[PDB]
Every structure is written in structure tokens, then in C-alpha cells.
């Protein structure tokens, strides 16, 4: 009988893999763009004293286009407790809607499957994927992931493609920072109880709803804790040209008069957006 204002919720979002992808804005729901397939070869090293030439072989200019997909839902009430309530259902239930959209958009833009959802770069499977070698222990050939791999992966990016960041679940970073050499010394951050460099300088943006190869942070791997070879660990891509995210209209809320039968006030919300993978040569995937 002494109700507080405390509203402990204890629910989490992800990070946002949105400010990386190239942003483009369209008014209508159907855009189209051009693409240079290949310039082709034009002219050879001909001999001298030859009053002639060769036509070579012309290039190619493809013409692509993509749609924009919509996102809608419905929620309602009873109009009786909403007048007597000790809270505000709408301002909470509305708040519950972008939280569903913001997290659904990000994941679908990552793992979307074809029809009526933008094809994420995971399921596209045209990013080149690099799988790491397994190791030996007491004769067993368990798969592993050493710091030697991480430096090899990030450095193997073609330099002329540009600067590229990296994306990975924080449990991988905790796995990297906690590695140990033969004697017992740490590899990174020798003798300061914590290794935490400024990620922005090492160009490693972090997230939390990637496949997370270390299942619940419980598969470091010596015996039956092996990484279960064939799991995603991290990605790296020049995102400003490897993947685009298009936006048409932000979310909207509109009362639905009709269907509301004087008991059930029924609101309606929706939004339109989309995405598509550009040249999926800038960008590689590390795997176990």
C-alpha cells in the first residue's frame, strides 16, 4: 500500500551495426542503380610496321535494382483498466514497439532470409570465409583459435580496398585478452590485471548478438569444450561500400477506428525500410 515509482526492467538491446553500413535514403519504394561488371581489355601490344589495329573486347555495365520491405504489427487494450491504472500503458506499449523494431531490423539486416526481408550478409554467403586450422593435444585434434590467427586475419585484408573495421561478440574479446603463453604471462596487457585498449584505435567495433562461438562463455576448449568447428567468430569489411541500408519512412502509430468494438481500443503501427549487399568482395569472414 506504498507503491513506489521504481520501474526495474532489466532487459537489454544489442549494439547497433547500423552506423557502419552505407546509408541511403529513398522516397518511393523502388530504387535502381548501375554497376560496372568489368572494364575489359582494350588494345594489345601490337607489332610495328602494321597498318592495322585490334578492336579488343568491350566491357560491361549491369543495371540492378532493389525493393523496400515493410514492417507492421498490432496491439490493443481493454479501455477499462486503462482509465484506472497506476501507470500509462500506451507510453509503455509504444516504447515497446521501436524496441521490437530496432532489434528486429538490426538482426534481419544481418541474417535476413530472402523473401520479404532484406538478405543479410550472413545468409548471403558471398563474403569469402576463412576457416582456421585445428591444433593437437595429447594426440587429439581439437579445433582451436589462437591469437596468431587473429593478427593473420585482420592483416590479410587487401590494402587497396581501404580501411576496414571488425565486428565480433565481446566473449571473443574476453577470450583474446585472457590468453596465456607457455610460462604463464599474458599475451596482451602484461601485468595490469586487465587488457582494454581503445577499440576505436584498433578499429574493432563490438556487438552482442553475433553468433558468439564461445557458447555462453563456456567453450574455451581443451576436452569436450572444443569450439565445435564451423562456427562464426568475427567479420571484417569496408562497410561503407560492402553493405547498404535504405530508409523510407520512420515508424508511425495510427488509431484503428473500426475493429475497436467499444471494448478493445486497437492501435496499429508500421514502418518501411530495407537493405541489400553491394559488392561483396570488400569483406571477409573468420571461421573455426
Amino acid at each position: 500500500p506504498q507503491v513506489l515509482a521504481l520501474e526495474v526492467d532489466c532487459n537489454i538491446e544489442c549494439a547497433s551495426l547500423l552506423d557502419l553500413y552505407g546509408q541511403i535514403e529513398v522516397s518511393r519504394s523502388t530504387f535502381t542503380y548501375m554497376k560496372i561488371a568489368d572494364y575489359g581489355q582494350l588494345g594489345e601490344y601490337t607489332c610495328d610496321a602494321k597498318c592495322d589495329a585490334e578492336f579488343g573486347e568491350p566491357g560491361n555495365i549491369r543495371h540492378l535494382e532493389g525493393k523496400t520491405y515493410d514492417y507492421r504489427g498490432v496491439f490493443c487494450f481493454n479501455r477499462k483498466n486503462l482509465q484506472e491504472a497506476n501507470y500509462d500503458f500506451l507510453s509503455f506499449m509504444i516504447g515497446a514497439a521501436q524496441r521490437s523494431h530496432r532489434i528486429n531490423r538490426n538482426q534481419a539486416l544481418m541474417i535476413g532470409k530472402g523473401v520479404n526481408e532484406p538478405k543479410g550478409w550472413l545468409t548471403e554467403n558471398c563474403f569469402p570465409v576463412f576457416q582456421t586450422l585445428p591444433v593437437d593435444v595429447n594426440g587429439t585434434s581439437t579445433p582451436a583459435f589462437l591469437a596468431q590467427d587473429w593478427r593473420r586475419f585482420v592483416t590479410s585484408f587487401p590494402a587497396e580496398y581501404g580501411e576496414a573495421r571488425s565486428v565480433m561478440h565481446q566473449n571473443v574479446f574476453g577470450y583474446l585478452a585472457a590468453m596465456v603463453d607457455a610460462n604463464g604471462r599474458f599475451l596482451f596487457g602484461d601485468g595490469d590485471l586487465t587488457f582494454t585498449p581503445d577499440l576505436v584505435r584498433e578499429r574493432i567495433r563490438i556487438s552482442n548478438c553475433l553468433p558468439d562461438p564461445t557458447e555462453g562463455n563456456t567453450k574455451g576448449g581443451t576436452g569436450q569444450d572444443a569450439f565445435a568447428a564451423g562456427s562464426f567468430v568475427a567479420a571484417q569489411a569496408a562497410w561503407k561500400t560492402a553493405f547498404y541500408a535504405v530508409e523510407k519512412r520512420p515508424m508511425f502509430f495510427e488509431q484503428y477506428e473500426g475493429g475497436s468494438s467499444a471494448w478493445c481500443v486497437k492501435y496499429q503501427f508500421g514502418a518501411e525500410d530495407g537493405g541489400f549487399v553491394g559488392c561483396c568482395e570488400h569483406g571477409r569472414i573468420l571461421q573455426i
Partner: peptide, 20 residues
Amino acid sequence: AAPSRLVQPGCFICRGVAVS
């Protein structure tokens, strides 16, 4: 929550010169 383990990477060094 049930007590979950915290298995961390061991002494990982080699991939091609396995001892005799």
C-alpha cells in the same frame, strides 16, 4: 541460475611440430 563453468584457453602454442 545453475552454476556455469568458466573454461578459458590453456597453454596453446603449436600447430605443426607435435612432440615425440
